[PDB]
Structures are given as structure tokens and as C-alpha cells.
């Protein structure tokens, strides 16, 4: 695997979004990995609907929290529409898939990275964008405005983001908070510390879509 991966530089990553005041990060996190595998497989970079997973994943609790795995599962079982077709409203409504005609695309399944394992995580990120969780509750996290984050943060993981690349001593994350946070919506978080939870719990819980 390379020293550096940046999926943005390979055209696989769509602009930074803002989840607003809804706890829909799990929807957001999932969508970045969907957009990434489809570009990697098809040559096309599209935007897919977070608002559909929010309305439609019935193992998750809308704006009250939920799971990237079940959201990735929904897309492997049924499919997803385009974002332009089913736009983000920041509030859970009823699930409107059926009244938006056929799904724009679908994935084959979901896999889970082996947790607490940095190398495992990096290998998967060398293949495509991965859904990872961290602890974002802290003021330093929220206050982040650039550089390589070493903390402080604990490993009470509360927030699903997507790992879109790595270097020698960070892992590059796309966050859903707007571009006016951090490094234009991105944060580079320290790796290599020998801490097995990862920094901010980063190696706790990681899934990626399978699609050929």
C-alpha cells in the first residue's frame, strides 16, 4: 500500500455537506462510501441521497441516531436515488423512495474492517473510502481548525465520518459539518500512536460497501 492515499485526488469524493441539527451523521458517512465505490467502479462521480437513508432505514432512529452498517445494508438490498432527486431536509419525514421511481444505483453488500487494527483500516482505505467512527463531543474537536489532531479526545465514539485517505502520520477524514470547519470540512487525525482504539476512538467501528 502507498505512503499516501487521497481519494479526492482521484475524483472519488463529492463536496463537503452539512448535516445541520439532525443526528443523521450515519446517513452521511454511508453516502460518502457509496459515492466513492461507484466512482471507483463506474468512472462516474455522483451524489446520492442521505435523506433517503434517514427516512428509510428502519433499524436506525432518524435524527435521534443510527447505524452506518444498516444504512449500507439498505443500499445493498434495495438501492439509492440521487441526491438531486431526494434532497436533504434535515428532518426525518416518511420514506419516499417508491414515489421517486427506480433507484439510481445499488451495491452488492457491506463489509466490516477488523476493529482496533490500524493496518487493517489502512489497507481498506487504500481500496476505497471507509466509514469510521470517532468521539466528536469534545470542545477541542469542535474547535479544530487545522493540522494533525492528536487530541484531546476520548474513545466514547458518537459520530460516524468517512476516511477518504491517509499519509505517514495521519488518516484524512471527510466530516459533515460544512466547509467552514477544520480544513475545508476535513480533519487529519494522528495515527501510529500504538493506541489500539485509535485517536478519538477512530478504530472502533468501520464498514465499507462491496460492489464488484
Amino acid at each position: 500500500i502507498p505512503e499516501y492515499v487521497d481519494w479526492r485526488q482521484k475524483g472519488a469524493v463529492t463536496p463537503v455537506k452539512n448535516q445541520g441539527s439532525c443526528g443523521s451523521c450515519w446517513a452521511f458517512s454511508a453516502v460518502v462510501t457509496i459515492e466513492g465505490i461507484i466512482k471507483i467502479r463506474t468512472g462516474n462521480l455522483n451524489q446520492y441521497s442521505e435523506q433517503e437513508l434517514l427516512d428509510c432505514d428502519r433499524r436506525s432512529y432518524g435524527c435521534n441516531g443510527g447505524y452506518p452498517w444498516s444504512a449500507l445494508q439498505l443500499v445493498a438490498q434495495y438501492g439509492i436515488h440521487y441526491r438531486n432527486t431526494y434532497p436533504y431536509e434535515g428532518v426525518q419525514r416518511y420514506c419516499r423512495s417508491r414515489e421517486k421511481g427506480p433507484y439510481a444505483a445499488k451495491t452488492d453488500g457491506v463489509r466490516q474492517v477488523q476493529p482496533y487494527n490500524q493496518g487493517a483500516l489502512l489497507y481498506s482505505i487504500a481500496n476505497q473510502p471507509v466509514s469510521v467512527v470517532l468521539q466528536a463531543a469534545g470542545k477541542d474537536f469542535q474547535l479544530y481548525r487545522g493540522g494533525i489532531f492528536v487530541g484531546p479526545c476520548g474513545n466514547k465514539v458518537d459520530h460516524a465520518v468517512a476516511a477518504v485517505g491517509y499519509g505517514p502520520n495521519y488518516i484524512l477524514i471527510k466530516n459533515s459539518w460544512g466547509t467552514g470547519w477544520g480544513e475545508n470540512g476535513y480533519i487529519r487525525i494522528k495515527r501510529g500512536t500504538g493506541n489500539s482504539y485509535g485517536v478519538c476512538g477512530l478504530y472502533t467501528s468501520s464498514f465499507y460497501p462491496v460492489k464488484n
Binding site: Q19, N64, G65, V157
Partner: protein
């Protein structure tokens, strides 16, 4: 695993009371009621693109109200907003998501 859920109920701090007191008037103006007593008793948080606070405030006699207050990301410097409230609530009613 489960991302985006509020925290467990924590008992109010001074921060809790200040956040309530910021939003006191907005309540009072929406409810068409003046609350003489306005004491934060409990809280939950959830991390969004900002922070939702869910606050149980002792307002009354044995009478409570629950608050849903939005706090922005620091870099945004927007004032606290009362997104929603619940009325006629009890000491022992659980602070839940709404």
C-alpha cells in the same frame, strides 16, 4: 456503533443554567407565560453540526418544562436557539429526544 444518540442524563451545571437562561425569554414569549422560577435540573446532549441540549427545567411548583436548545459550532457565533419545548412535564418524566 450507534452514532448520533443523546448522552445519558446528566445533572445540570452552571453551564446548563446559563444555556437555559439564555433562552428563557424565547420560551416565555412563545408560551405566553412568564416563568417566575427557571431552574435547570437535568440535561442530555447530542452532537450534530453543533450541539442540541435537552434540558429539564424546574419552573413551577411541582411543574417542569423540557427544552430543546441549539448551540452552533464555535466558528459560527450564532446565538442559542430554542428549537422546541415540552410543557406540563413532571419531575420524574424522562428527558427524551423530540
Amino acid at each position: 456503533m450507534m452514532s448520533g444518540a443523546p448522552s445519558a442524563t446528566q445533572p445540570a451545571t452552571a453551564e446548563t443554567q446559563h444555556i437555559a437562561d439564555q433562552v428563557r425569554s424565547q420560551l416565555e414569549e412563545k408560551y405566553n407565560k412568564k416563568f417566575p422560577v427557571f431552574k435547570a435540573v437535568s440535561f442530555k446532549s447530542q452532537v450534530v453540526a453543533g450541539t442540541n441540549y435537552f434540558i429539564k427545567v424546574h419552573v413551577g411548583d411541582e411543574d417542569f418544562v423540557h427544552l430543546r436548545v441549539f448551540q452552533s459550532l464555535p466558528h459560527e457565533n450564532k446565538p442559542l436557539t430554542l428549537s422546541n419545548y415540552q410543557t406540563n412535564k413532571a419531575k420524574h418524566d424522562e428527558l427524551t429526544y423530540f
